[PDB]
Design a protein around this ligand. Sequence first.
Ligand SMILES: [Zn+2]
Ligand SMILES: [Zn+2]
Lengths: 94, 95
Amino acid sequence: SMRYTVSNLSMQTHAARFKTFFNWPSSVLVNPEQLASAGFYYVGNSDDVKCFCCDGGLRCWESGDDPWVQHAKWFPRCEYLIRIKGQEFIRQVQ
Amino acid sequence: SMRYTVSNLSMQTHAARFKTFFNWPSSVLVNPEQLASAGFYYVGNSDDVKCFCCDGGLRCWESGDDPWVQHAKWFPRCEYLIRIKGQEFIRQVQA
Ligand SMILES: [Zn+2]
Ligand SMILES: [Zn+2]
């Protein structure tokens, strides 16, 4: 067996993730560009997103929700979140 | 936002983990019995499994893979692994 850190290899790029928000509702008010930058792609319902790396799923996004802060709130061990924001950032949010 | 994906905390029992392997691919030649015993549950994607305790992810399972040995190979600090098999076993595998 091999260790893996990335659940969805097909969603590793920003463009691949951002494309999934083509049919995302304008009533949500969290920006799909920022969601995509934070590792998330749209998977169903009104606003379900998953992280391509940790495979964590978040929904019921509130206006003013910060995609990176939510990622660190719920999924602090995510290796993508660590690579971009660093463990200091995560420790701060936790 | 709210999490909706499954938590490692729901996978603490052998039975709950075993249950996840209902659709485990026939082509993957490692038995769900030994996987569940070793702390792993199936995440529904391909042959990806995760440990309920250390959250380690393993894929690409090969014929004859011993899940306990693989757990010790890749995640030697896992507290579940330590509790069941011991550090003597883990050290043995690591060298
Ligand atoms: Zn993540
Ligand atoms: Zn483990």
